[PDB]
């Protein structure tokens, strides 16, 4: 809860992609091509902070940064 000392918390996590994702083929979002990251099964995404209220993580992959759908990654 809110009371007590801060706990250890990793601001960066590595997450394995379990499914291919090309926003142009699969995203329902009007701004997908601008803001979402493309990736392939087996690639690992570095994820920064928490998922947003829509379910996306801010991720990095091979020099490119963008939002990634949490439901395509291994939790």
């Amino acid at each position: 809860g809110p009371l007590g000392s801060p706990e250890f918390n990793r601001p960066v996590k590595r997450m394995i992609a379990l499914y291919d994702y090309d926003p142009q083929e699969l995203s329902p979002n009007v701004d997908a091509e601008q803001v979402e990251l493309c990736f392939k099964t087996g690639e690992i995404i570095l994820v920064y902070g928490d998922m947003d209220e829509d379910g996306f993580y801010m991720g990095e992959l091979d020099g490119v940064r963008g939002l990634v759908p949490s439901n395509f990654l291994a939790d």
Binding site: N29, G55, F56, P69, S70
Partner: peptide, 15 residues
């Protein structure tokens, strides 16, 4: 217009 997740894949991962 809000953002939402794509539909979740239903087939087992090929990984």
């Amino acid at each position: 217009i809000g953002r939402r997740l794509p539909p979740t894949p239903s087939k087992p991962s090929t990984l």
